[PDB]
Structures are given as structure tokens and as C-alpha cells.
Symmetry: D2
């Protein structure tokens, strides 16, 4: 029997690259998505034509609410229903937009930015562990958490909380043989709404090649951490940033 993975926000960009690479390594995959239904089903279709019955999709909003615990439970339940086991969880889904200290209500901004980036990872980790060999969780963090973008306080709060979860969950789930680690991109795939001039500005900041990480490069680090080559690694966060975090103002 092949092992099974849940990947959150897996329809496009980095989450798709992680899902694809896990599938190429021999995992069966749950492609979680929120709004990108067409891209999700398209991806599932490509993977299933490579190996029959190895990919399913699963829709869920990961905004904080009183029903979020049930949604996260159902995500993990979908992996067990499709494949009979759940070996790996990748917490990739993330809301990302500014929240100036000095449109959506603030309560909605808190719910989305802290829900997607921190509370849903926590609830999915709870559900994953309570349902349970090489078991692991990988959280997508941010290499620039201590050198944050101006006006992104709530996003930064969420990613710092995710670092805390990674460490707290590593410590508490170690007795159960569940490893918990992080992968911290610097600049990888730039925002679609970003103009080429702004993208180039960011690219020229990166010491190693003056270019962003490919989605495959991020996925490589995730694959290492779930592999038997990382069997003693837990509570670690691997920066995949081309040196960006090392560059002063």
C-alpha cells in the first residue's frame, strides 16, 4: 500500500508543486482547495491518468469560525475515506494581504489571516494526530518573518504563530512518532497581481542568482523532510530563500 498525503491550498502555485512531487514519489494525495475548483479538478485529473485512483479533491474554507474544527476534521477524514490512511499533512494554504495599523471588516481580516495561517494548521494537526510508518507534518512558514513587509501585521502574526505551532507540536507529538517541521520560502512565486517592474525589484535583492525560487525548489525541501533521510529531524525550519534573509537594509 502506498502512503497518503493531505496538501492544503493545492490547486495552484507552490501547493500544486508539492502535491505533484509527492505524487511522483508515490504518495496518494488529497488536493484541498477553496475557490479554485477548476484548477483542483484539472490537477486531480492529470494525476489520476498517471496512476488510477491516486488523487481526490476536497473543498473547504479555512477562515476561523466556530465550524472550522469540523471542517479540519473532515479534511483529514476525506484522506482516510479515499485511501485508508493518512501519513503526511502539508499546511500550505494561506491568506496574504496588507492590514495597515493606521473592503473587509477587521474581524474578517483577523479570521482569514490568523485562521488560514495558524488556527487551521493547529486544528488539522489535532485531527491528524487523533486519527493515528513515517508520519510527518510540514508547515509552510516565511523566511522573512523577522524582517516583515510594511503594513502586513496580521499576516506576520499568523506566520509567527505557525512557527510556535511547529515547535509545540514537534515536542508534544514526538512520543507518537509524528515529526513536525517547517519550510520557509523567501521570495518564490510572486503574486499574480504584481507588475513585472515590482517583481524585478524583489528578484534583484536575492544573493543567489538574483531570482525567485521555483515552486519545485520549495517542494524539494518538503520532500526531504517527509523522507526517511529526515527520520531524526523534528521541530526544524528549513529556509529556502537564496540568502535573502541575510541581506541588510
Amino acid at each position: 500500500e502506498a502512503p497518503a498525503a493531505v496538501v492544503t491550498g493545492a490547486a495552484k502555485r507552490i501547493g500544486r508543486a508539492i502535491a505533484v512531487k509527492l505524487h511522483q514519489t508515490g504518495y496518494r494525495v488529497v488536493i484541498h482547495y477553496h475557490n479554485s475548483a477548476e484548477a483542483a479538478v484539472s490537477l486531480a485529473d492529470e494525476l489520476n491518468k498517471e496512476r488510477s485512483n491516486t488523487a481526490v479533491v476536497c473543498q473547504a474554507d479555512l477562515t476561523n469560525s466556530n465550524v472550522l474544527p469540523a471542517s479540519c476534521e473532515e479534511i483529514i477524514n476525506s484522506c482516510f475515506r479515499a485511501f485508508g490512511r493518512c501519513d503526511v499533512l502539508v499546511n500550505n494554504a494561506s491568506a496574504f494581504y496588507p492590514t495597515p495599523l493606521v473592503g473587509k471588516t477587521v474581524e474578517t481580516q483577523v479570521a482569514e489571516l490568523i485562521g488560514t495561517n495558524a488556527i487551521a494548521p493547529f486544528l488539522l494537526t489535532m485531527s491528524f494526530a487523533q486519527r493515528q510508518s513515517n508520519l510527518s507534518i510540514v508547515n509552510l512558514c516565511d523566511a522573512m518573518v523577522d524582517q516583515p513587509c510594511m503594513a502586513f501585521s496580521l499576516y506576520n502574526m499568523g506566520k509567527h504563530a505557525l512557527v510556535g505551532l511547529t515547535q509545540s507540536a514537534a515536542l508534544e507529538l514526538a512520543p507518537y512518532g509524528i515529526r513536525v517541521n517547517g519550510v520557509a520560502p523567501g521570495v518564490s512565486l510572486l503574486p499574480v497581481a504584481m507588475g513585472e517592474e515590482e517583481k524585478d525589484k524583489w528578484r534583484r535583492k536575492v544573493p543567489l542568482g538574483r531570482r525567485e525560487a521555483s515552486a519545485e525548489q520549495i517542494a524539494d525541501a518538503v520532500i526531504f523532510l517527509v523522507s526517511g533521510s529526515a527520520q531524526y529531524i523534528t521541530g526544524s525550519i528549513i529556509k529556502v530563500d537564496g540568502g535573502l534573509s541575510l541581506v541588510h537594509a
Copy 2:
């Protein structure tokens, strides 16, 4: 006129010591409380005996909810109402209890531990900044954030988010002349519920005198950070832990 400070959770323990020390330094103070009305008024009475009309109380639940933004705005407004200005915000209020990965609903535990420790500070910070000299904010963090207590994941996530708020707000509010810093206790006043045996276990681990920090030692670092002696300091977190965070397992 005298500057004014808001201290959250100021009725007892560390928040009380901070309020008293700010008052002794010449601040007028807003003593915020949730459940400890008797104790908040007792402190206010003691401070007003020393200087008439220099201490007022303010009630608010700081749990995350649809009304938390309004409650945070009214805490800040109460300082302006009473004293005509607000120079210092101290984010001290904090829920603290375990939340095992493997009684209150989990959605309530999220609301209290992430609301009090992180979301309320963010909303109080926004309100403080919007309503604006030596302006500063001090957040009460935790020196043991990277070596967390077993089964305290939501608490640890909240304190990590508070570190992120401290840094993000320091950056964004620097152009307004508002400094943002933290004080990180290790073991100070032990939980009232804790047994005397476990209390002594924790005391014995501390390199500097095998004892906990008094509330007044924590308050001393807060006084420094809001003073004219700290006018170039922002985004910094001062550990006050007697070396505890340096001690290996």
C-alpha cells in the same frame, strides 16, 4: 500635564506592579480588568489617595469576538476621556492554560488564548496609533517561547504572534514616533493553582538565585522601556528570566 498609561489586566500580580510603578513615576493610569472589579477599584483607591484623580478603572472582556474591536477602541478612548491623552499602552492581560493536541470547546480556547494574547494587543495597538512626546507600547511576552511547556500549543502560538506584532508594529509605527517593545518574563509569580511542590521545582531551575522574579522586577524593565533612557529602542524584547531560557534539558 502628566502623561497617561493604559495597563491591561492591571488588578493583580504583574499588571498591578506595572500600574503602581508607572503611577509612582508620575503617570496617570487606566486600570483595565475583566473579572477582578473589587481588586481594580482597591488599587485605584490607593493610587488616588496618593494623587487625586490620577487613576480610573475600565472593564472589558478581551476574548476574540465580533465586539472585541469595539471593546479595544473603548479602552483607548477611556484614557483620552479621563486624562486627555494616551502616551503608553502596556499589553499585559493574558489567558494561560493547557490545550493538549491528543470543559471549554476548542473554539472557545482559541478565542481566549489567541484573543487575549495576540488579537487584543493588535486591536489596542491600532486604536492607540489612530488616536495620535514619548509614545510607546510594551507587550508582555514569554522568555520560554522557544522551549514551550508541554501541551500549551495555543498559548505558545499566541505569545509567538505577540512577538510578530511587536516587530511589525515597531516598523510601521516608527515614522509616527511610537516605539514598540517587549518584556519577556521566565518564571515570575507562579500560577495560584500550582502546587507548592511544583512551584519549588521551577524555582530550583533558575540560575540566578534559584527563585522566581518578583512582579516588581518585571515592572522595572517596563519602566526602562517607556523612559527617556530608551528613546532609540524599538522592536526589542528584554528577557527578565534569571538565565532560565539558557538552561538545557
Copy 3:
């Protein structure tokens, strides 16, 4: 042709496992040693039996001195003479013993602990870069911010090594040279240590209540030098079973 790696302190324990795994991946290797000549040679012979003319040894003291820069240049040069290239440097060699604040002279303790852990790595890095998937991997310590009592000079050396990893990552990135670290917590315990003392350390590790094998540390080194790590520089990977997360 095949790439080439220099591994310092490679005769035994962790450095030996790193050299073996690099060789198994297809690297030719320079096995550096200080005092362990018989172990270094027996490793070289074992590897050459697998593939002819793929392993050589190189003796050098890495203690700080006036001759240290020349010694470090000769180690790098030995890789070029043997194999015509040098793609990977692993800074593994390390002196480790207490230096309380309150029969070696203190100047000798300084020379050995700061030399091996920090100054030699810097000099080897300089020589490596000046001679040019190129990368350097430094062996750090996961417990650098929760140090053993009375190991001030050792801890200083290891912190300096973190600094070198970051500074060199930044400076050599334009030449395509990546610089990273692997940080063990408790791996192979000292040879003389009694099992009852070994057990006090093993019991502290959340993931399996055991120390890392040398092979597990080598696994992280192999990842960092591979094509799967080609955007990774200035990063330090903890391989510690969660030990650094455990409070007093």
C-alpha cells in the same frame, strides 16, 4: 567526471559517515585527519576497494597558529592535485572539552577550540573560494543557545561558525557557492562515557529517547550538497530529535 569533496576530521564517527555517504553518492574524497592515521588509511583503503583512486588522506593540525593559513591552503590544494577539482568542503573537525571560567594553558585551549571550530573553517573557506554545484557545509551545534556548563570557549567557537556560515553564504553567493550548516543535538556520545551517563542524555530526546546515528547526520549533509538544495544558502538544519525545544 566525478565531483570531489574535502571532509575534515573524517577518520571516525560523524566525519567518517559523511565521507562514506559522499563516496556512495559518487564523490571522490579527501579524508583529513589529525591523530587518527590508522583509521583514516583503513577508510581510504575500503573506499578505493569500491572504486580505484577515489580516496586519499591528508594529515593536518587545525589548531590556531601562524602556520594555520598555509595548512588550510594545502588541504584544498591536495583535493586539486588528487582529483583536478574541489566541489564540496565539509568543516567537521572539532576540539571539544570544558574550559571553566573559575593541564593545558588557556592560550592553548583558545588556539584549539577556536582554531578547530572557527578559524580553520574560515581559512578553508577562503582557500576553497579562491581556487574556483559548489557548496560548503559546516557542522554546528543545535544546543548553541543552551550550552553545557563550563564550555564557554567551545560555545564561542560554534557561535563564530554560525557567523561564518551566514557571512560566507552572502559573500560567495555571486560565485554560485552555497554555504549551509547541519546542527546535531546529541549524536554519537563520547567513547569513554558510561552507559548510565549516556542514558541521561538519551532520555532527554523527545523523538525516540535516543541519540542520532552518524548516518542520520550524514543524511542532512547529503541533502544540502545535492541538486534538491540548489536555492538553499545561509541555512542551518537542526538534526536533534527535538532536544533544543525541551525546557530545563
Copy 4:
């Protein structure tokens, strides 16, 4: 009886401001210097004019060598000889210049940069402890230690080692009642050699005021750490950087 302090590299700039402020607070001071003999003697004279017999000078090269331990022992001995006690050590002296990886020999550069910034502090700390109230040591570190200047590898190594010393010594000397802490400037007094246009380049990076720290602002943080307001603080490093270390590339 007045306590006594040793300040290394105290003839000029930040070390001088530290010596003056300690003196103003009531300390007798040893003014260590290397080349700046006229400035050291000028400072001792000003301080002695204010309170007789409260300042002496001590010349010493702090480059690494087989005689450095003797030199460090002598600096501490000079304090006991003049004042009969030594309560405070401030490790401020520092070489600072680039050492690119790709007319001083590299041997000399290692000696100077690692000697002054790290080995001399270690040996001074040893002598101080062995010759032994509010005893404490303050190391001058660097807020940019993780975002270093290009081509400053040896300097950066020295400062990283000083962080390690601060933490190791705090742990080991706690049982003797000796506290060990750090103060980490960002941009303070800029290099004398640096041109006006570069200086302006750095000033414009600082979020809080777009200016460098005064020497007196750095000294204020040292004063706090040696005071009775910091009796439970050990192994802590206070950044005094106006937010500089928070700014991304």
C-alpha cells in the same frame, strides 16, 4: 564606598560615553585604551576634576597572542590596585574592518578581529570572576549580527562569538551572583573614515528618526543593565537600533 568599573576602549566615542555615564552614576572608573593616549589622559583628568581619585588609565593591546591572558589579568589588577574592588566590566573595545574571502596578513587580521571582539572579552571575564554587591558584565555586541556587512566575515565571527560568551558566562557565573548581558547597537557613531554620502545612506535606513544612535543612547542601555533595576536580568542582549534590524533588503 563607591563601586568601580573597567571600560575597554574608553578614550573615545561609545566607550567614552559609557565611562562618563558610569562616573556620573557614582562609579570609579578604569579607562582602558590602546593607541589613544592623549584622549584617555584627557578623560581621566576631567573625571578626577569632578571627583578626586575616581579615574585611572590602563594601556593594553587586546590582539590575540600568547601574552593576551597576562594583559587581561593586568587590566583587572589595575582596578583592584587603584580602587580595591571591581564591580563592573564593560567589554567595548573592538577592531572593525573588512576581510574579503576572495596590507595586514590574514594571521594579523584573525588575531585583531577575533582577539578584540571575542578572546579578550573571555579572558577579561575569567580574570574578573577569579578576582571576586551588584556584580555584572556588559558586552557590546551588534544588532546586525545576522544581517552582516558584505566582506566582514572575521568581524561578524567575533561578534557571534561574543553572543556565545554572554550566554555561557551568564550561565556559569550566576551562582557567584555575577550577571552577564549585552547591548547591541545598530548604526551609532559612524566610522571616521566613512564619507558623508555613505553616512547619509545608512542614516536613511533607520525607521526611528532616520538618524544614528548617539553614544549617550548606547550608554543609557549599559547603565540600566548594571543598575539595581536589572537584578534578575542575565544572559539578555538589548538591541538599541531604532528598528534597523527589522528592515528587509
